[PDB]
Curated annotation (Swiss-Prot):
Native species: Severe acute respiratory syndrome coronavirus 2 (2019-nCoV)
Name recorded for this polypeptide: Host translation inhibitor nsp1
Ranges for domain CoV Nsp1 globular: 2-113
Record gene name: rep
Function: Inhibits host translation by associating with the open head conformation of the 40S subunit. The C-terminus binds to and obstructs ribosomal mRNA entry tunnel. Thereby inhibits antiviral response triggered by innate immunity or interferons. The nsp1-40S ribosome complex further induces an endonucleolytic cleavage near the 5'UTR of host mRNAs, targeting them for degradation. This inhibits the integrated stress response (ISR) in the infected cell by preventing EIF2S1/eIF2-alpha phosphorylation upstream of stress granule formation and depletes host G3BP1.
Top-level taxonomic group: Viruses
Residues covered by region (Disordered): 1-113
Subcellular location: Host cytoplasm
């Protein structure tokens, strides 16, 4: 399928054990896609003082449309030293590996894959 219904566990930034997907724009987008597919991807909601606690390059999920079965359509945009790779709508959060942290909520997304 071109789109996949996912429920992403929302993690507090201070709980996150693995604070990024890797060391290049291409690697983090690759790793984010694999974790999204394997159900091993968490979401941190972006606020003041969140991003400097996470590792660049960042992977964002961004609203791609204005929401089937409650799932907001999103796509991936990466960021490194203030340059973004991709063009999309409003940020829903930054993706990180999920390694068993207890979530505070779930974000239903429809991922363009």
């Amino acid at each position: 399928k071109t789109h996949v219904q996912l429920s992403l566990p929302v993690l507090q930034v201070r709980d996150v054990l693995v604070r990024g997907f890797g060391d290049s724009v291409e690697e983090v987008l690759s790793e984010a896609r694999q974790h999204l597919k394997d159900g091993t991807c968490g979401l941190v909601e972006v606020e003041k003082g969140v991003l400097p606690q996470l590792e660049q390059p960042y992977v964002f999920i961004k609203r791609s449309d204005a929401a089937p079965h409650g799932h907001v359509m999103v796509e991936l945009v990466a960021e490194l030293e203030g340059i973004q790779y991709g063009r999309s709508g409003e940020t829903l959060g930054v993706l990180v590996p999920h390694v068993g942290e207890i979530p505070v909520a779930y974000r239903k997304v429809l991922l363009r894959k």
